[PDB]
Point group: D3
Chain length 251, copies 6
């Protein structure tokens, strides 16, 4: 029994939930859901793992999107069908600005559309802009936690390699369009790359859905250290604490 093609969920399964937290990794779903009351596994199909839970007496969904806009668009669409109206994406990310450290938290106001799925919802002229309420909740939750936060634009790429101008690859080549592109995003003040927000934010802002995006900085292109596992795990839980507190303000 399922009301949607991919997620293997019913409207009944949601228990009146209208907000979902949407990480990329199916394995981070339970860990996120465990921070709320009465966490319970719902379904798991392909890259879509969903759990339901409770915040302040209200039902909340946690569901993975997988990597990239296409699978993200499927989860967002099918959750919307089942009644979700607010989406909070939590992620990890690599920063392209020197002044941003591993451990910091990024809140995305809007994304550069280096994806394709967003164009399936709005013409490129349309802004991949986050919901103001969502962004406010995220920024506020970050501050009441004491996290060092940066708010601004994020480049959202359909690839991990060429679209983020990595040259350490099989071909060692990046297509004309992306040559010298990172230095250009940096000069334009772009904070980071990730791979889902352009699709998420465009498809929501153009369909009367609310969307927010927050991420933990676990690496920095422009820095020379690495550094290590324990801070990456620590920062991750920061962002996770943050997205849950934000969700609390939006219920």
């Amino acid at each position: 029994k399922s009301d949607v093609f991919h997620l293997g969920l019913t409207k009944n399964d949601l228990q009146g939930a209208q907000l979902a937290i949407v990480p990329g990794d199916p394995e981070r779903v339970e860990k996120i859901a465990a921070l709320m009351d009465k966490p319970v596994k719902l379904a798991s199909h392909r890259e879509f793992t969903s759990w339901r839970a409770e915040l302040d007496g209200k039902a909340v969904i946690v569901c993975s999107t997988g990597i990239g806009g296409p699978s993200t668009s499927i989860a967002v669409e099918e959750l919307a069908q089942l009644g979700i109206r607010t989406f909070l994406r939590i992620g990890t990310t690599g920063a392209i600005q020197p002044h941003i450290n591993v451990g910091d938290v990024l809140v995305t106001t809007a994304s550069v559309r280096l994806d394709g799925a967003s164009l399936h919802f709005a013409p490129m002229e349309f802004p991949a802009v986050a919901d103001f309420a969502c962004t406010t909740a995220l920024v506020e939750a970050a501050k009441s936690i004491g996290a060092t936060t940066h708010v601004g634009v994020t480049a959202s790429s359909d690839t991990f390699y060429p679209g983020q101008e990595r040259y350490d690859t099989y071909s060692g080549r990046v297509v004309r369009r992306f040559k010298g592109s990172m230095e250009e995003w940096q000069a334009m003040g772009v904070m980071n790359y990730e791979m889902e927000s352009a699709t998420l934010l465009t498809m929501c802002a153009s369909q009367g859905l609310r969307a927010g995006m927050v991420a933990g900085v676990i690496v920095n292109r422009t820095q020379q250290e690495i550094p290590n596992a324990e801070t990456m795990k620590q920062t991750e839980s920061h962002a996770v604490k943050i997205v849950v507190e934000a969700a609390r303000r939006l219920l």
Copy 2:
């Protein structure tokens, strides 16, 4: 004297770092008179500039004229003079049935139906407002009890075809814009105006802060032409909001 178009010098600004940029040169005077020590600085072309003081802090008011090109000149030369924050105040025609004339719109980002924004960033880049600025605008409109709508604005290089107006000399709109208004409407776009895409883009991609607020004068979905007195209170209302917002950003 220092910049080509505005005819202003670094000295004229008095260490001012924030600017309110209306479109109408004739509205500059008024906005500035709402603050302490209003003083006229210059007037060239569509650029009239005044200095004023807000909580003891120098602030500039400078008209942009209609459209991205002249806006982009005003902002650039002001940034050259030290301005880092820009708050646009304007008038708009709502295109959502639920938005009544006299409402206040705060723009988080704009649909880029202009050309000047492309001179700063490729189309993929979001014409997104600065968070602090948008927050200040929202909190000002609320503290003043204005019915506020917060969302996306379609920013057009034309008043007529780009906003799909057919009541014209030619009566035709180019293919790309045939059926575009209903599209924007279905997408939740609040309104049309003609500067924010250039503004938000050129600021967000150059390390400058920008926000925009506007008062609704018309509604492309309602039939009653607005009351000549409501439009006036609304404008002064949007103007009250932008001035209050600037205080938070000083």
Copy 3:
């Protein structure tokens, strides 16, 4: 009155079918004063409009302000008012080493580096001047004896990055425009300005006649901004003589 921006009525025009359209409102009166019976009409925003008379015919002078968007407003509403021929007089930056400040440039067509022209025709459509208007402009220029250059113009939505000026706040220009000036120059492009692409496209694609002429106030192969200070009535007298031939 009859229109949303200009504050004009058909009556104000007095049967005028031609308009001279400069950018700066503060020189509308100065152009009007070259003709007979100049009378100010209106002034709202960047649109200052005057009426004059040339060889016993009514002529309008109305400023566009800087850029296609306000130009598109002026042109459209003037058209509603009955204007069918538009002659733009402007200032410009030369990108060819041999063009002197004070020279008169007549534009056959423009490189569309704007956005407003796209609101009238797809990019494939040429931003081309009306041939009668261009002939009148060239013929009038030959009458005056001005050092004149005829050809293509780059029309930009910005004064700075779109014309590849680097002396700016950021000192950077977006990828699209890096090394663009050199390319227009190699293509034989004469100059930069900010309104002709919009004007010529919206007119050529709506059955309206349009001409374009400008005085050089900077050579960009030398510097980004004029000194200047400076101090071309030549282009202005040419646009008036031209309008004379088109009445």
Copy 4:
């Protein structure tokens, strides 16, 4: 532990393999592997589950891509880093031609690029084309198996909904560009919609890698479970047999 960032694989894991079969669904990896000799699990991370097997004494990889071009581009790139030079996508699909029925097998010569990831590898003018040897192998194996086979173009979309012009959705609207697009693909002779091939074929064709695609039609858009299953098993047999001819 790992030579790549996502797949969690080292070169040793491939045991010299140069060919990978790439399904989308991580849970179909075992079943495909199970058709070959000495099938063994390798790793599972995110949507990337990988198995190794053997075909006529040669090491073969099966690795899922997840849904869509972005994750696909990661799987292919990292596998290429591990030494894979030939990629065969196996899939399920919905036909958009009236003459293409469920149970049929489609071999894709090239794809309509309705995705974003292909552009990170080559400009839009570049063909998202399959490698000829792979296509030959897939076609010949299908003929060997007796499958009703269609060889041609496929539409590859970054979405399952608007990009395939579905309206039975939360918004009930499809963006301008995709309005009436299905009927156009149909009149152009396009066989089907799926979600990975544009990325897969473009990134391979522009990087000296071989790629091909076969899929089973389980559904027709213009108009049961057990016959859906029996079809997939046949398209799966097809890809495995084609793999043999490419080793």
Copy 5:
């Protein structure tokens, strides 16, 4: 021998010519040349047939381009290599405005770039604009010949069928882009369709060569000798 790859012409063959009249049809070259002094056949390769004649004691070239921008661009480049600096195209065309009649002469000021080759010389933003002295000579020649002449914008298409929105084809299909395009061109005041001017004009205007465009109307979509005489007389004025 030849100094160029396709035309099979030598610089010597031009005898100093600096102006070319460029028809589309190779079979039309001889006819045009025979309206001038001392017409001599030069070469004939692929769709490029070239003659030399003499006009007012000046060497002039007549060279066919074939149909379409690509071969047109080959002929122009290779003629420019041989010293040609001025190109006048003479063509046939279908008018798309009710007021233009078959037998009328059209002079093109600029073209809608519905082609590909023009993009090999300038970005789409660049106008496919004709040279002013050439357009002037064509317009003044038209008066001399006594032809009903319209001056304005031409739609230059890479195809004869779908790009001119013809549906009477094998497929009966025209691609999204060109569905409803003819009516829009008409509403924009576009005069006619043809297939070479966008390329010709763009490549000349962006490379410092002079080009002009004139054509006889052979059909009107809403329902050649003059044009040839005009192009020859205009060539006189440009020597």
Copy 6:
């Protein structure tokens, strides 16, 4: 004057039931391709469109030139399809851009980089300029039958011979921004060669239910110094022509 089509000057009767056409660019090459077949006979010649009929294993086959470029290619293909042709085999010569490809080698195109304008008149840029599988198979097999050294892959199809193939030895010596550094990119992407008709041919056929294939003889290598004389070039041309005819046999 008896033609069912606007340009070609051909009637259906002329085809005598033919359903396949060989479509070279050069009008002068039509006669010589038909000469590899039985009972060849000239049908017509108008503009750059010269056509012959001939027999292959007892079946009527058309040979018709397209002229240089997608526009006249698009006319020749459309009007022949009207006449009944359903399969098109283009044979050309080409300049290779890969060092490993030798002059005299033969290229079979699986799909083309669309550096043309005519293709867009049949399908948006997203659509692949891809060859029919049967035709490509026929050409590859035929290449083996003849014994040619064959490469199969992607071709760059450009609307110009000069700036679009990044040639600088020109009147202007200028190459527009889009094409600056393009040959090096195509090379890096594995593209085999440049030519000027295939993007149009392949797109219009693949998006209109027609079959099309592309084979070419390499008469020059852009990466190499030495340029072969007409003798070895004519020799190359012969091989490709033999291959297109042999390939046609398998498609009848």
